[PDB]
Amino acid sequence: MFDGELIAKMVVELNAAMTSAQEALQFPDFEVVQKAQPTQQGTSTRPTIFFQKLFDIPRGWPATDWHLDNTTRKYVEITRQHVETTFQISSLHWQNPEITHVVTASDIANYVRAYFQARSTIERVKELDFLILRVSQISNEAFENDNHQFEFHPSFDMVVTYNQYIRLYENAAYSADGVLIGV
Amino acid sequence: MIPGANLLRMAFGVIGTQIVKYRKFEQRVKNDQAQYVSMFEEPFDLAASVQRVRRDQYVQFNLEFQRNYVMIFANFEMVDLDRDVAGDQFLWTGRVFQLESQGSWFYQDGWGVCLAVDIGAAKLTDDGKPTF
């Protein structure tokens, strides 16, 4: 119930990180995309950042709070489950030997990581209802793109922690009818 | 003799030919960052039959790619990747193509066949000509 809103907020933050990355170092434009496109649509020549969902690890038992609706005398139970999702955040930017202001896809991925681990961005993301854990590795791997050249597709896993709320119904009671039996 | 002569030259008498802008490897040096820069001879026109190769899309890293191919029969010595050598390059329909395979037949017969992959859109001159 949250991955849509989370993906929207993550897209906003990723586009912000790309706007910042346009300042320190320079790229010809940028794009932020979800890796598994639900319809056939191509990879982009421009330097882009991909993000994708990998897991979802609930953390701790669900916490149930009881809220009275006061109208129908029904205890609405609110089950909050904590969640650590894992986002695979990758980058793609072909490298031109002729140009002199070289910037590698590793640079873009590293700058995204360092931006998303800074404390100001952490506090902003907190104001946007989730947080970010540590990124412990950035893997720069090589492959062949469609032009029979060599490209790097660096990627790292970013853990995002948040809560998701479930609303259900239960019956209330305002009475106490005991039976005091003698042994 | 038939393995001599030039069979593709004779075949060009009946079938039509496409004019591609061929460009031959000259030398190559490394720029900074150990990436390595290729340089080429002057471009020159070449009469060749550029037939298709079935290009099929595929999936890598959850993205979708597709390698564009053309098989060129040309009456010239065409050399791709080699030890201490980079491949050649020809322009066709405003698209760059670099050779991937090598059918040889040159020193036997004078012609050759090569599989070439598209690289990208050609640079456009000020006058509108589609060459670098």
The two tokens of residue B71 are: 């098989």
- DSSP collapsed to 3 states, chain B: CCCCCCHHHHHCCCCCCEEEEEECEEEEEECHHHCEEEEECCCEEEEEEEEECCCCEEEECCEEEECCEEEEEECCCCCCCECCECCCEEEECCEEEEECCCCCCHHHHCCEEEEEEEEEECCCCCCCCCCC
DSSP A147: T
Distances (CA, A) of A64 to A75, A81, A165, B39: 11, 9, 10, 69
A34 in reach of chain B (CB within 8 A): no
Q: Alpha-carbon distance B110 to B97, whole Å?
A: 21
Give the resolution to one decimal, in Å: 3.5
The residue type found at A116 is F
Inter-residue contact B111 to B8 (CB < 8 Å) = yes
Q: Alpha-carbon distance A42 to B65, whole Å?
A: 7
Inter-residue contact A159 to A165 (CB < 8 Å) = no
Considering CB atoms only, which of A41, A100, A146 is closest to B66? A146
Is A35 in contact with B63 (Cβ distance < 8 A)?
Answer: yes
DSSP A148: S
Show the CA angle centred on residue B39, arms to residues A104 and B36, nearest 5°.
30
User: Rounded to a whole number, what is the distance in angstroms from the first to the last CA of chain A?
Assistant: 53
The Cα of B3 is separated from the nearest Cα of chain A by a number of Å equal to 33
Q: Coil, strand, or helix at residue A12?
A: helix
B65 in reach of chain A (CB within 8 A): yes
The two tokens of residue A55 are: 């897991």
Is B63 in contact with A41 (Cβ distance < 8 A)?
Answer: no
Give me the half-sphere count of Cα atoms (radius 13 Å) on the Cβ side of residue A7.
14
Candidates A87, A102, A90, A86; CA nearest to A139 is A90
Q: Alpha-carbon distance B55 to A86, whole Å?
A: 35
DSSP A22-50: HHSS--S--EEEESS-SS-----SS-EEE
Considering CB atoms only, which of A50, A95, A145 is closest to B65? A145
Q: Alpha-carbon distance B97 to A102, whole Å?
A: 24
- Those residues with Cβ within 8 angstroms of residue A99's Cβ, 6 or more apart along the chain or in another chain: none
Q: Alpha-carbon distance A126 to B127, whole Å?
A: 56
- DSSP collapsed to 3 states, A100-137: CCCCCHHHHHHHHHHHHCCHHHHHHHHHCCCEECCCCC
3-state helix, strand, coil in chain A (%, to 5): 25, 40, 40
Residue carrying the six token digits 């089950």: A79
The two tokens of residue B52 are: 């298709």
Cβ-count burial of A39 within 10 angstroms (0-12 exposed, 13-18 middle, 19+ buried)? exposed
